[PDB]
Design a protein around this nucleic acid. Structure first.
Lengths: 120, 56, 121, 209, 114
RNA sequence: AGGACCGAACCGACUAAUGUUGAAAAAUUAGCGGAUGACUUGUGGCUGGGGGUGAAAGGCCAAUCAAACCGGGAGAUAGCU
RNA sequence: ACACAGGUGGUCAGGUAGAGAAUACCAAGGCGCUUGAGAGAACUCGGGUGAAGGAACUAGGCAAAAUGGUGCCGUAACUUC
RNA sequence: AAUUCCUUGUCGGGUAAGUUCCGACCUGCACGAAUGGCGUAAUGAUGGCCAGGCUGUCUCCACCCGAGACUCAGUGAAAU
RNA sequence: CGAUGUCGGCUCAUCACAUCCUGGGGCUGAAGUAGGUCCCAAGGGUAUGGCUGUUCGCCAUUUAAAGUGGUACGCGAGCUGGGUUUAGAACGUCGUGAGACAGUUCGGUCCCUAUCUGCCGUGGGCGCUGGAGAACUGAGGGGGGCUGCUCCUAGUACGAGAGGACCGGAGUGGACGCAUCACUGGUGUUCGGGUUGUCAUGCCAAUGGCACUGCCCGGUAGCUAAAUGCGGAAGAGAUAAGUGCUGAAAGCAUCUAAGCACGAAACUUGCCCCGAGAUGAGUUCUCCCUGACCCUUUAAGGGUCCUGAAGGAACGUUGAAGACGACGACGUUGAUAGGCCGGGUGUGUAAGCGCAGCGAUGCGUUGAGCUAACCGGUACUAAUGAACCGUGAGGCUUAACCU
């Protein structure tokens, strides 16, 4: 059963997931938008916003302790400094999602995960 | 197990009753995109309700 | 605990070391349990000085259940022993003359009086 | 008396001065006013049927709107029959409460069980687990045998194995009246009731124990 | 929920200290022996965690007779009545269950201070 | 020093599990044994079917072994199906 | 028979830890094993953990568990010493 | 007794309770001296048995993490 | 015999009654007491170990009682492989020998993804006659049916005492079921911390990675037992064996022939669940449609135009629902998920900075920081917005009412 459990396995074990999420986190910062499988985006949503919350507040500590949550200088450099004023314009909700249907390798519904404050 | 006996043609088409793809009536129109597009997804020019998501 | 086996402690001067249960009485195939019930015993080790013999079949009362017993609100007194007081087997009387060990209030209730006069806590 | 439909909305245990804290389940009643009626002028029945309200007046249909308005307005996500032959009640809403069970001291409580679904031998039918690694070759949670040989040639109707758990109405009887709070609309019952939180549940008077 | 919160405040009616394990305590509990409102002392070793709101836990090591008990305290039961804090200490773990195994001598722990 | 000990390599196959229309016409995994020798292996060489070889089981001698395989006697013969 | 979880000899033999061609993590260097994507059931497999009891299991403590290193102490029956 | 049919022989030890086991007894169906007899330290992936530690083996099963199963999309069998 | 796998176990049962217990009686050498024996009774229940390959048996200790027998001496396309019986090997024995052994011993591949029947669940059509949406009646079917002890009665009846009930009542358990995490605990790789090795993040520090979750402690929600609650009833109805009245045949007698009365855990109910495909398709309530034409044997329709509704699904967002469908909830007039804020919970004084100590590290800052699956609130994000499917006032017969 999974009654009031949340968190998908996805592909593999948690040990794949934490690498796989850290990649996609940084890729989000790095390039703005990501097109991927619809379940995947709606799972990565849950746990990348916590980088974004830590980063709309100025802290030196929480940056280094927020590098316990990421790795890569660049993305915690973009966060805070460049995606800080992006996300100082609100609390709550740091992506819009929207969707895009099946994939051409096999039929698998895809969605989007992308920043909402630049996406124009 | 390993079956016995030969199923009849009937018995095939009887399972294939339930086999088919759902007719979604896929085409649909927005006032933000009059395209002939599948609803709740891309219009093929990025829109969903307007707003281009695509850069490719 | 378990109807078969277990190695129980002596909470009383007579007998010593490991003391096997062989049937948690009340029967009907009683599964685990025993908290303050009379249970058919066979002592496996006995006190080496003084004699009541080893290998005898006796009865004992479990007064110190390592899983636990409880009431009045279901607040659990969880023992760290597995001990009992050996009892006459044709009767019910303590053979042991001193008892040391905390005991259950379910032995205060009903005819068992002898046990709970000679042990504290 | 009749039982009325509240909803369970948590579970607690409530202390008394004599040192017992019995288990409790806090069913929250909220008005059950008498909407539809079924009478012996219409034969077969002598129930009464009631409401609990509902979140919107847009979440139900035109048929599911009519029947209501022909007995005052109050919403409804449901109606549940409650036989009676005396203890007569009447078609206009009445908004009766826990207040019933302040002269009742037994109750039943008749909600819906939560269920898990899938079912399975051991997990639902409570068979043994064996051949863990002592001669394992599939055998764990298997039903083992299910039948004999050719002198029944078949397996009897209603034989347990696989299927379904719960998602049905259930009751265990009793689940006594502990406190009647007719003004916060709490009903503190004795022990664990039918289903998880959010289940509807009648609370009939037992005379069945 | 809100509806088991209101009820739960209705039953919060103890006013107690704050207990950080490694507490020595002396619990005085209504025995109700034969309708006696005597109160029996239970100096013990707190181990288990309090709170979970209303419902709380504490527990004893007694070492009565070379071995003890554990006795869950609620701090909201009338049976509890009143509970002395006594000596308290510093230890990083919030359980001292290695005191069931490792027993006396290593039962000792550092002091919290004040 | 040792057909010594503990143990990788290497060799070998004691247990169990998984496979058993396999991943595979004998393997895989976790354990296991032996381990400078009565060792082990590469290269090459040598023993031929009523024969070899065999620390010996009727085992092995090309996924075949109480008499190999192939051709031929031969469309053996079969009161048998 | 397959781009087959198998088999296949010699040569080169890096760091740290470690006794080490163990092992763990890294080099140099080369790869992710040619269906993916979901839901996470039952059940099956593969593991991990289990309150209390501790062989009651079973043909049998099979498996697993638990034991394990190094230094130091201390070491019995017996004996072909 | 890896030998003994009757046989769970009989007695003793161990076990709470021991058709096995172990020590004996000798009524050896139908042991026996190089188709070696009786011992035997050491050795053993040896047989059998007991005991300690230890345990999901069991009591008494539960949850979890993975690989399938299940579902989609592509590909696409089998014995019968 | 063109393969019907042996025994035993395990697992899973199910039936029969020639009944072991409970139930109800008869007789009793029926003092009581437990019984003995027999009649009726299958509703329910009906033991673990020790030895042995054996089922069995013997033994040990309970138990209310550990029934008996059948089901391919029940069950291997469910498990096991110990025995018997493969090929190895040996002893004693038999045999000249090779070899042999219902004598014995140690070792020794248990295969198969289910088409169909059957079962346990669960959908998809169509139907139920205008079409729908809900709510039920209850025909039937299934589940469930156990019982000790103690206390009261009453130390009464009985008994020479010792001993010691009946009838009935209460209470507290055992076994079994059912429900549920609130409590007690377990798990909790998805939460927090410690810690071993090493590699990395330029380096230090601090971390992250990897090592069966690296190791290890604690733990949230949920699920769950070892936890906790609850359940097997009373009482009816009609009876069995039985116990009777009244009572002829057969002036009496006679429980039966006429007629009536009680009488069991059986049976019919009462209780709980499934339950109108109950095609005998039931009933109650509500809602939506009350436009034209044309071509026909025409009153039976077929087609065309305009409407297309109520409602459904689809689809999305998801749920203490879930294999998939299904069901449940919501889709901006919104709390439906996630996020956010706050709470709570669990860990246990983060990092950095300052000070002390040569250092390791401590203290202070700071019961700090972190914190999910939870709870409360909050539109921050996505639930976009058309569409689609579904139609268009109801066949005949007859009765009743209405002009």
């Amino acid at each position: 059963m999974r009654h009031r459990k949340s968190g998908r396995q996805l592909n593999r074990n948690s040990s794949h997931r934490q690498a796989m999420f850290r990649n996609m986190a940084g890729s989000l910062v790095r390039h703005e938008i990501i097109k991927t499988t619809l379940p995947k985006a709606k799972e990565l949503r849950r746990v990348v916003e916590p980088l974004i919350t830590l980063a709309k507040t100025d802290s030196v500590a929480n940056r280094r302790l927020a590098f316990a949550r990421t790795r890569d200088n660049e993305i915690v450099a973009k966060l805070f400094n460049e995606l800080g004023p992006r996300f100082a314009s609100r609390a709550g909700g740091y992506t819009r999602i929207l969707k895009c249907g099946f994939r051409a390798g096999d039929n698998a519904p895809m969605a989007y995960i992308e920043l909402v404050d630049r996406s124009e | 197990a390993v079956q016995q006996n030969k199923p009849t043609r009937s018995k095939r088409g009887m399972r294939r009753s339930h086999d088919a793809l759902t007719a979604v009536t896929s085409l649909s129109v927005d006032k933000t995109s009059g395209e002939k597009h599948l609803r709740h997804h891309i219009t093929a020019d990025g829109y969903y309700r307007g707003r281009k998501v695509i850069a490719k | 605990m378990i109807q078969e086996q277990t190695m129980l402690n002596v909470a009383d001067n007579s007998g010593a070391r490991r003391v096997m249960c062989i049937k948690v009485l009340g029967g009907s195939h009683r599964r685990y349990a025993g908290v303050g019930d009379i249970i058919k015993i066979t002592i496996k080790e006995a006190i080496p000085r003084g004699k009541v013999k080893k290998g005898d079949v006796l009865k004992a009362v479990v007064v110190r259940t390592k899983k636990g017993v409880r009431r009045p609100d279901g607040s659990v007194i969880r023992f760290d022993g597995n001990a009992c007081v050996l009892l006459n087997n044709n009767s019910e009387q303590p053979i042991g003359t001193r008892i040391f060990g905390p005991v259950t209030r379910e032995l205060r209730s009903e005819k068992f009086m002898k046990i709970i006069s000679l042990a504290p806590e | 008396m009749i039982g009325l439909v509240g909803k369970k909305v948590g579970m607690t245990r409530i202390f008394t001065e004599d040192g017992v804290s019995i288990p409790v389940t806090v069913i929250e009643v909220e008005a059950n006013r008498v909407t539809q009626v079924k009478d012996l002028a219409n034969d077969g029945y002598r129930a009464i049927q009631v409401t609990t309200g509902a979140k919107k007046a847009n979440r139900v249909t035109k048929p599911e709107a009519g029947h209501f308005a022909k007995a005052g307005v109050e919403a409804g996500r449901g109606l549940w029959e409650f036989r009676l032959a005396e203890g007569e009640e009447f078609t206009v809403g009445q908004s009766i409460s826990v207040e019933l069970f302040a002269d009742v001291k037994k109750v039943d409580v008749t909600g819906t069980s939560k269920g898990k679904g899938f079912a399975g031998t051991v997990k639902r039918w409570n068979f043994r687990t064996q051949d863990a690694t002592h001669g394992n070759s599939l055998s764990h949670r298997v039903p083992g045998s299910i039948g004999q040989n050719q002198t029944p040639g078949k397996v009897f109707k209603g034989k347990k194995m696989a299927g379904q758990m719960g998602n049905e109405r259930v009751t265990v009887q009793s689940l006594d009246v502990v406190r009647v709070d007719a003004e916060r609309n709490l009903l503190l019952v004795k022990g664990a009731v039918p289903g998880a939180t959010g289940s509807d549940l009648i609370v009939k008077p037992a005379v069945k124990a | 929920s809100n509806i088991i919160k209101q009820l739960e405040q209705e039953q919060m009616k103890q006013d107690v200290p704050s207990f950080r394990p490694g507490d020595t305590v002396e619990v005085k509990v209504w025995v109700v022996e034969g309708s006696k409102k005597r109160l029996q002392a239970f100096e013990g070793v707190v181990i288990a965690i309090r709170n979970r709101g209303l419902h709380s836990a504490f527990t004893v090591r007694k070492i009565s007779n070379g071995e003890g008990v554990e006795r869950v305290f609620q701090t909201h039961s009338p049976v509890v009545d009143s509970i002395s804090v006594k000596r308290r200490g510093a230890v990083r773990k919030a359980k001292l269950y290695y005191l069931r195994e490792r027993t006396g001598k290593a039962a000792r722990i550092k002091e919290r201070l004040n």
